[model samples]
Structures are given as structure tokens and as C-alpha cells.
Target: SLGAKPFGEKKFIEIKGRRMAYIDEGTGDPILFQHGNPTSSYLWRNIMPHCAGLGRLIACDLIGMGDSDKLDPSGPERYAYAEHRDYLDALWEALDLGDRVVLVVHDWGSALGFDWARRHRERVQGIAYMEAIAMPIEWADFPEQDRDLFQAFRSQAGEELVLQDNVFVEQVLPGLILRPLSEAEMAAYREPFLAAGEARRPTLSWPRQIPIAGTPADVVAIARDYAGWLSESPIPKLFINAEPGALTTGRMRDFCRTWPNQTEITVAGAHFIQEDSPDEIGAAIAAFVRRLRPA
Candidate 1:
């Protein structure tokens, strides 16, 4: 595994011959959890058991991040949003994830969950998301404090902050949450990027992928495409919000609130609710899953 990990038996499958790591647990309808930048399936270890019997929980590392295989000579060019989706698309297909799949996603992973459900509306039973990029956002809607730092990630300064010094993992990741990460837990997050240059590629690419200001016009368009689907779709959903800490902010939350067949749960922490309120987040996911297939 990734050294002192909680998720048992790091399973993997290949995409174009590169391995993608995932954790598989329990059984029932599949409940796939997708994580975003600087984190991996490890993000769900503290919560997966909470919903295990309710459904089969599967969480995968994005290509180039986590325990998943990284590219040779990793570059910002190959690690963009579309490339990540292309690989994940193959992995989802390879797993032959049956119908009645439920999705729980966080950070950039939110777009993956929302976009998949938008396309395969018939296959997904429901979705639960926190710190999501549920819609294309304007710089105006972003957290005021984060704007400057985010802008830095897209600049030459990003090489310093993300690739070299790795502020994204060492500092920014933990600081965004409300609690302390245990030494082992923090080490798991650090394992993937232990090497200097090529290894941290995806971590840097994700911030730039944020669909803000209509940059990466395609990702913004993709988010817009799924926004229309979600706003009107009848599939049940749970929108998890963290007080003063989540990236969903009020605007995205406002948009999510209007989606049909929706449920909202609020927690008392920051962006990474899993780190701050795993019990509450897990219980809500369990409740939402059980609601989808009432016993």
C-alpha cells in the first residue's frame, strides 16, 4: 500500500498499461467515491466503513496522483482535466461497474461524478458531493482569500509552490481543513509526490483546472453541460456543505439547492469535510444510500 494506510489491499487495474489504484470494500450496489487533487482514495478510508454494508464502496486514485501510475516525464500538458477524465472513463469501463452505481465525490472529483451522472443518468442511482466544482465559476464567486494563491498556481510561481517545494501537499492541503492529520495519515498523502519533479505534476495541474473565468474553456463548457442535466434530472442527490471551509461557497450551494430531488447536509468544518467531520459525512452518505434503495 502507501505505507501505514487504512484502506485494505490496494487493488489496481490498468489503463493504457499504466496502473490505477483503488480500494474496494463491502458489497451491494456500488458506491464509488472519487477524490481530487493532492489526495486519493485514502481520503475515504475514515468514512468508507460507515457505508460499507449499504453498498460496495469503491474509491480510485486519479491518474498521475495517489498510488495510481504517473506519466513518464510528467508535464502540465498531459495532466489537464480532459486527460484525467479520459483515463477515469477507461477505468470505470474496465471495472464493468454495473448499473445502480451511486457516486460520492469531492474537490475536482465532483465534476467527475456530476459529469458521469449527467451522461449515464440511467446508470447512477444517486450522488453525494462536498467541496464540489458543480458549475463553472467566475473569479467573482471564488473565495476572496484563495484567489491570489490560486492565480499563483497557474503561473511560473506554481512550479515553485507545487512541483518543487510542494506547498500544495505540505502546507495548503492540511491548512484547508480544520483538524490535524496524524503523522501516518499525512505521510500517505505525501507518498505519491515523494519524488521531486515529475511526480507532483497532477497536483499542480488540478488548481489550474478549476473552471474559473472560462479558462480551459472545454472544462467550463463540460461543467455547464452537466449543470443543465443536474438541474433537471430526477435522480436523488445529497449536497454536503461545510461551514466557512468548503469551496462550494454560497453560490454553488445555491445552485445545488435548486437541483431536483436533492438533500442537503451541513457540517462544522472546512473544505476537506472528510478530514474535519468524517463521522457526520459518512453517516449522511449512508443515509442517502439507504434512501435510494429503501429496505
Candidate 2:
């Protein structure tokens, strides 16, 4: 168990002919934890335990990542943002998590969770997000230090860096989180993309789908659609503001605040706040969840 954190027993659900892997635990109202690219449900292993006795904690890995089944011919440029939404939406239906469900999201997972809440506004109880994509971003808005690196991820060098080289896991991951990663801890992140070439497709797709500079029209539209809803929706929102974040920059911090009905929980962290300050984030969400459903 040293090499990989035990996430209880693996659970799988069929979605659009492919399997979406998940770890379901605890009991009571549904509390879904959704992770973004380059990380599976294992990303929440430490945090989910802190939420014990709160509710039914469910962490679902995206299609083609983690224990989830890989796609046939899992070639680059195949699993677009829309393709991911298709199956993730199906998984939501499959779970049938009922009304009053809560969401804890990070990275691209924010888009999915936000999108779903807008459509099913009546069903959402509360939403808590960290390093979230609150709206479409412009190139000038990106961090000056990391701008070139992000461009490299989207340019011709993308294939080499992401697919063959695995920079996202090997480099960006450790670099983003403030704390250093252990050998076994790094192994768990690498496990999902063990195979080269097509296997790393999911990782690459995420950076590509990030709604920056308006290139990804569909993703941009989703963020646009959810902004209005987020500003108006009375559903309680918890904003886990991490320090010196990779994504949540000063500008983004202000942008996120424009949304109403939000409570802030400050943590010392970078992008992957879960890795550096898992306990605090977990405790924040636990308290947030407690307020939603009275005991």
C-alpha cells in the first residue's frame, strides 16, 4: 500500500460502453468529489478519509484515466472535451444521486460540476471548489512565469512533452504542489498513464481543453453559461482559496469572488492543494457539508 494509496475497493460503472472507475464510501447524502486531468480519484484518498461520517463520499475518475477503462485506439486528439462530457454525464445519470447532492471539484472537474449544476439547479445542495476555472481566460491573464510552459503544452511540442515525455505528471505535478512528492506518491500518479503514445491522451486533452484565449469554443461556452448561473444561484458555495496557486492567480481570485453566496477557506498551497493541504481542505469541505444537511 506504500506505492499506491488504498482507496477502498475499486468500483466501476458502465457509461456509454466504457467503464468509469470510482470509490464509493461512507453513507447518507451524496457528496461527489470530482478530479481533473492527470489525476484519478486517488487524488482524494487522503481528503476523503477526513470526511468520514459526513456523507456518502464518492470520487469518480474520468474516462480513460485511473482504473477507468481506456478507449479503443486511444489516439491523441480523439477524446475531446465533448467526448468526455458525454460519458461523464451518463455516469451522473447512472449514479442517480438524487436531489440535495453536494459537489467538491477541482481543475477541469469544476467545469463539469458547474455545468451540471446549472442544468439541474434544483438538485444541487452546495458546491465547493479549489483551483477552479471560473471563466474563460485570456493569454495575458496567465501567470508570466508559466506562460511559455503552457504555450509549449499547446504548441507543436505538446505531443513530445505530454505523450512521450509525460511532463504533466513527472514535472508539472510536483512543481505545482508546494510540498515535495515521495517516490511512491509519484508512482500513484504515474500509474494511470503507464503506457506511452495513445495512453497519455487524456492528460494532453485537459491542457488542450482549458478555455484559454477562446480556442476551445465549446469549453469557453460552458464557462460562459455557468457564470450567470453561478452569480445568481442561491446554493451555498465554498471557495477554498489556496496560496500562490498555479491556476487561481490574483486576477482569478477576484473573478471567483464575483459569484455570490460564497464562503472562503484559506489554505497554504499551490495548484494541487489536496496534496499539500489535504487535511485542511478536507476539513473545510466536511464543515461545509455539515451545514448543508442538518443532523
Candidate 3:
């Protein structure tokens, strides 16, 4: 279903007195699709069909992002990794979904998903990641320019340079990708943020949350804990990295170093691997989950 033009379906999940919009369609084992940074459940648009019929595939919009209610969060209380995990925790508990979970994560979702899985290891059956951060040690491996970008965000530069603007998505982001996007594809991203600068929160907040050398104390704590969990857990893992992602570049190597069991695969794309390489992402996930399912 590569070119099938993905569809959007919504379910209401009430948590913290707000209705969280999610997508739930499909059968078989449960595989949760989590988006990172700027995008929402829409990130998995093309990849959803591959896993829908095969098992229970659920995609949720993180609060403060996507179709979910955008509550104004102060400091890290609203947008921090803790909130991300807690919201997910509520979703899982409310649904009474057991520990058996297959996670497909990208960008910030990679870090958030993995961190949550570590805390609840039994529920995580496997993980398929593209352009996601696995360990903090990888930050040291970045080039000078990359380091600068991290610094800017860590310093709250996104508040000044909002990415929700068409200038960033249509011009800046497209420049990073090896291939340009179609008119429709580009609009899919831009149209979501119809309200002037609402989408900037998640996009800019992502870099600020990167825990480099324990500087961002919370990020450091989460990464440390997640690294340890990866070392101890027996979950099947797959990493599909885009060649030119600003955040996930060096992190994949560090991930493999810690979890040598990880099945690492490189594909063409940028940070938004789904936009460029959804086929590989979906196929890898399908195969990985199939291996974990009972024969």
C-alpha cells in the first residue's frame, strides 16, 4: 500500500480531563505507532495499512501536538518527556492493554517510546525505529554544526525560530531531504498547522529535550534508564536511519553499541523517514513483528 494514500480515523481517549485523538483499526498483535517532534499520528499515514490487518495497530496524537487537544503547558510540566510517558501510560491502562506491545517510533517518539518501554519492559515485544534517539552518548559524536543546532534548541532557540512557518517546512526542511516532496505531501505537513504558530511547540521543544551529557537533567535521566533497559530486555529491535537526519545521525551507532542485538538498517530519507522511505519502514516492521508473533 505504498502509494495507497493513507486515511485518518479518530477515536476519543479521555485522559487528564482532555480527549486524546487516536487511530485504532486492524487485528492481530498490538503494535503502537508513535510519532516524534513536529508530526502527529499522521506521520504513520502510509505505513498504517501494512500493520492494520496483520494485528492491532494503534496510533495516537501526543497532547500539545496533532489532533489532540493542545493544552498550554508551562515549562517541562506540560511538554516534557514525563508528560509524554504519563499520557501513554494512561492510554495503556485505560484500554487494559497488556504488556505485550510492539513499538514503531520515530524522532522524539523514539526516545519517548523507548524510555516508556524500559519502565514497562514486559509490555514491549519489539521496536522498529527510524530517526529516533536511543542513547545520549551519541550526542558526543555530532559534528560542530550539529552541535550548534543542539545548543540552540537546548537554549530554547526554537521559541525564537518557529518551525511551524511555511518557510521552515517548505524551504528549510525540504533542503535537508535528498529528494523534494510533492505538492500534496508538503501540504500535508503545512496544512495541519493552520493556526499561525501552534505546531511550533512540539517541533522546537524536541531539541530542547535532548539530554546531552546530563545537561538537560531529565533527558539524561530518561536516556540513562532507557540505555540500561535496552541492555537488560530481550525485545526484538530494528533501527532504520535516514542518511541526513539532524538528530538521529550519530545516535543509531550508539544504540547498536549498547544493544548489539538491534537489527540496524539504513535507508534513504531525512529525519522524516516515513515521507521518503515508508516502504522500507513498513516492510521492516511487518517482518520484525511477524518474527515475534506465534507460529
Per-residue C-alpha lDDT of model 1 across residues 109-191, encoded as one tens digit per residue:
98887887887889998888888888888888888877888889988899888889998898888888887778998888999
Clashes (candidate 1): 2
Candidate 1 local lDDT, residue 286: 86
Q: Which regions in candidate 1 have their CA more than 4 angstroms from the true location?
A: 1-5
> What are the clashing pairs of model 2?
none
In model 1, pairs of residues that clash are 245-270, 245-271
Task: Looking at model 3, report the run of 10 residues with the lowest lDDT sum.
Answer: 163-172
Error of 3 at 36 (Å): 0.2
lDDT of 3 by residue, 36-121 (tens): 76677877888877765677778888886767777664443346677777787787677656778888888788887887777777
Model 3 earns a TM-score of 0.87
Error of 1 at 99 (Å): 0.8
